[model samples]
Target: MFKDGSLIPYLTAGDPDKQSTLNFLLALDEYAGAIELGIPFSDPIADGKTIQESHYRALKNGFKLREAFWIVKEFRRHSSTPIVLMTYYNPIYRAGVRNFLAEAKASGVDGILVVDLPVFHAKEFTEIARAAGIKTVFLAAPNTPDERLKVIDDMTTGFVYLVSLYGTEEIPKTAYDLLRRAKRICRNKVAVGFGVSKREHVVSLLKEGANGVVVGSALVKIIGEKGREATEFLKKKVEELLGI
Candidate 1:
């Protein structure tokens, strides 16, 4: 279940509030092959400054699991662009594994990405997700050992989300190399995210064999800085970047 050569746009759940998110996503599905819907957590150690701030704002606005469900259900109404939940394990555990997976499938989510879930805990999580026809995607970082990479590669059912650098700062060079290496090792689609903020950057990652690119901070920054125009700008940018 690789995405092959495709583009995926990521947006924070409830960023600038849920209504805005719905609007952005409704427009967003037309441009990208898939969507990475972030369920904001209090601590996003792996995210960059821009994304962390947005998560903070979303949390402040009281983003919750129920809202996340609504967003997914709403998106499913118009598009089947594969929706992957980018979240942590605590939320899943608290929500109940069986119940969450059921809701995810009913809401038309295509996959789940539990950031901090190790294979031990994820064994059950992945099973539940798969049982409900939801793919379970995981992250493989530059710092990950070969043994772990093998595990992640073997266990991951959908595309593999490759974090292109060891840390979360704006390191384009690091992303470049990490993307290349990950493509070499990845058995499934290697979707590159982290620090991809511009059209040039996504093009560069594509050259390195990235099947999907998740852009969050840049989009969020645009929405926050430029308001309504961000939508039009993003549509144009992605069109130019993907050469579509």
Candidate 2:
């Protein structure tokens, strides 16, 4: 699906409610190359401030792990756009890794990006995911050694998520170079995330040979500000970003 560079937008599932979340996904189908649907958790270590708040909001609205699966299943009935679940390893372990992958596959999820699961510990999970034809995505940081990055390349199936910056709205020059080096090592694809909220950031990553850009907190921040109007806001915002 991401033959060309992708603009991936993330939203926390059940933030307001299932209907609104479904609406947002439907609206995003035309604009987003892929959608990163985040499952609400008590602690999201990899997320920034906006996403942390979003997770709390979702939990307050009766969001559960199962609800996320239903949302993706519903979205699949309407659109064929790629859906990647951004979640933590705790929930997966709680649900049983193999069982979780089975249900996720049944729910029509294409790939999964587990925030806290390191490559070294992902052997069994990766095996199950590959058997189910589901892609496994892993994260890479700026200071990650080349040796580890090569290992990440072998472990990842969908794409490698390269964190650009943490809890900020800036994408530095070094971020592009990090992506450049990652692109050289990773055989699947290298996508950049974190602090990527602007058209310029998307352009910069793509220019530096990134296969995709994941926009998280920025879009989640809009949902916070716009309430139910968030769907319309995202449609416009995605157009604005991807049109670049």
Candidate 3:
């Protein structure tokens, strides 16, 4: 996946524990160009069972938005792999947008993907993030209107997360059309995610001209099931998916 384009892996912070999450991040840094660190939220509506359950585990392990930043701070001490926080807007509000953006930049975050933040409400946040030198990412589904895509294109700096489907199961045909259309107008990078769990899927998206691919739940599932062997499992899974 990284060879063809960018390989971006998403993981919930403090899933098994913060240490395990850090270990996974360090291991992933070797191959992935960037990493999507998901901060657990009570309501992760955009995520499916696999990711939501990972969130539960993370929160159960006492993960909080503050701790998420601490983990990133720790990661920055070791690697320079671009970090993108996949979170909801509620936490940003709780910490205050300006403060959160400042802290995130200080913690070495390169971008953020707030799932629930609407395009209309993004202007200020986008501007603030840009000022903080942090990239703002937005999500776009296949059913999203072209006008909304334009808004997302204008607001986003990292890449538009093209949700191929609502759940972590399959990529729909409409997704290809959407990606094709998105590439036509969006000047930023376009990454197709959601239900992207296999090498075949990565290849298909690559053929569609995606600038990147985000793999979430499947890898999270591996980490959850692998327990103490999670790091090794992640290394193997990443190499397998990227055919390294």
Candidate 4:
């Protein structure tokens, strides 16, 4: 599902609208190792302002969780690129995790990254997901304890997401240190996210030994600014980031 140095783009499922998000997914399927599609929760606490507004815009237009499934279902008819839902846990609970995951698997969702779910609290969800053949992606913080990290490393079926920092700050000195520690501590592949907006950021992280990079707000913000018309520009931005 990933190259040695993979690129994963995180997107909001119904940012400008459902079709636009689907278009982006089809266009991006060839480039990304995996796509992390946000489920557009009402309270996106893990996100920065750019991503938060994207969620608001999506929900304001009445984009339900089912709509995201529809988008992936559509994308699946044409491509099989892995789609990981970068989501909050509430919606899963509300919809009933077992049923939600069953529907997600049928819709071709490959994995999930519950942004607010602590690894310790993920047993019930992860167990059901495993049975449904859905992968689990867990986040590791810069300050995460070695003990907890071992659990995350052991439990993560998909790559471990190394959140370099709490804020979307473009880039950070702290991120590199976490990458260093993560390489030593995590047996699972570490994919770094948050503030990874630059081509240089990707280069540096890969050079420093991250298995993958997750770009979120940088792409989501482009959609926020340009709406549906952002496709070509977003493509160019992705190309630039990839050094393509």
Candidate 5:
């Protein structure tokens, strides 16, 4: 599904509130190649200003690990979109790795992408998720060494998520050399994410080597700008990007 359509819309799990997040997911499932749910934690170092602001709002509204689970459980009652949880490792660790994987599978989760769980430290969690039929995604940055890249290629199940550049700013890649280089090392499906919020960016990734692209900050920004019209706002962007 991801390779054919090539657009995944990401949303924070508890942003604004549980109900709002569920509605956003339901609407996005229509066009999303896959759904990446950000389980907003207090200390999300990788997120940019837009997601950082959303995380603050989510935490202020009493977002926590249990609530994140319940929100996904409820969402399962409504849809079966291929869902991937994007979270910090602490919450799952605190909840117990085995129990978290079991419960997440029970709730119909398809995969996980732990932002801080790089290839070197991923064996335990990756094996657990794989045992439960859950795909564990890994991220590769520009500076990722070659040997480690081989390990990430071997460990990753669902796909390799590539963060286009080093910084938080939305500086577009002038060319596809970095992405093409990563694509050579990665063995699984490749998806370009982080700072990709526009149609042209998605097109660029597809032309390079990526199988799909995930957009997050742009979705959060829509919720900030359009309120209840957030889904409509995102749908327009998706159509524009995918030419759907």
Candidate 6:
């Protein structure tokens, strides 16, 4: 479902609070091909300060794992956009594998990406998730090999996420090289994310044959500053970024 310059925007679940998150999701659901909702982990190691700070805001607002499902269920009242939960593995494991996936599917979650789940340990999770009707999305680093890229592609039922940059947002040649390799090796769609805060970045990634390009900060920053009122600003930014 992620292709042809598809924009998959990432929003930290309950960034400021649960209610605001649903509002943001409702506004975003109008155009986003898929929504990546961060589960607000205590340790958001893979993300930078802007994203990290929002997670803290969410936690400070009393956001919890269970409440993410509630947000999705409420969002389902008006939208059918695909929901992809991005989270650390502890919450899922602590909640029980079977228990978590069932709740996720029933609550309208269409896919998931366990940020810290390694490929070697994903077989059971992938199989169970697929059987339960939730798509499994896998991540690959910049230097991950062709052998492993295909393996990640093979595992995911939807799209494979290529984490172009870990700490910074610079779209260096390395990220493009990785995307090219992934497109060459992977059978399923591949999306590139991280540090995508500019329209030019989105254009470049899509030009490189990315099935989808994820944009952060454009929406997240406004949410932090304006709460629910950020909707119009967020809408304009999305239109600006995806100018057709």
Give each model a TM-score. 0.90, 0.94, 0.93, 0.95, 0.90, 0.93
lDDT of 3 by residue, 2-116 (tens): 2338888899998988888888888888878678899999988877788889988888878867888888999999988888988998888878998988899999889998989
Candidate 5 per-residue C-alpha lDDT over 1-244 given as tens digits, one digit per residue, 9 for 90 to 100: 2554367877887778888888888877777778888888888887777887788888888887767777778888887777888888878877788888888888878888898874455787788898998898887776666676677779888887777544333435532555677777876887766576656677767877778878877788888777656777777877776766
Across residues 1-244, which tens digit of lDDT does each residue of candidate 2 receive? 3655788878999988877889888988877788889888998866778888999899898888899889999999999898888899888888888888889989999999898995467887788899988998888887888898998889888878888545446677667667778877888787778577677777877887878888777788888888678988887787777763
- What does candidate 1's lDDT look like per residue over 1-244, in tens digits? 4356677877888887887788888876777778889999888877777778888888988888778889988878887787888887788888898888888888888898998886577777777787899897988777776667667877788888887533343545666666766767778787887666556777667766888777766677776675545677767656766766
lDDT of 6 at 70: 94
lDDT for each residue of candidate 6 in 95-182, tens digit (9 for 90 to 100): 8988898999999999999988965668988998988899988888888898988878888897898875453456778888889999
* Model 5 alpha-carbon miss at residue 186, Å: 1.8
Instruction: For candidate 2, list the clashing residue pairs, or say none.
Output: none
What's the true lDDT of residue 123 in model 1?
Answer: 76
lDDT of 2: 0.82
| The candidate that achieves the highest TM-score relative to the unseen native structure | 4
Q: Model 6: residues >4 Å from true position, as ranges?
A: 166-170
User: How big is the RMSD of model 1?
Assistant: 2.3
Give residue 41's lDDT in candidate 6 (0 to 100): 87
Show where candidate 4 strays beyond 4 Å.
118-120, 166-170
Residue 188 of model 5, lDDT score: 80
For model 3, the run of ten residues with the poorest summed lDDT? 164-173
Better of 3 and 4 by TM-score: 4
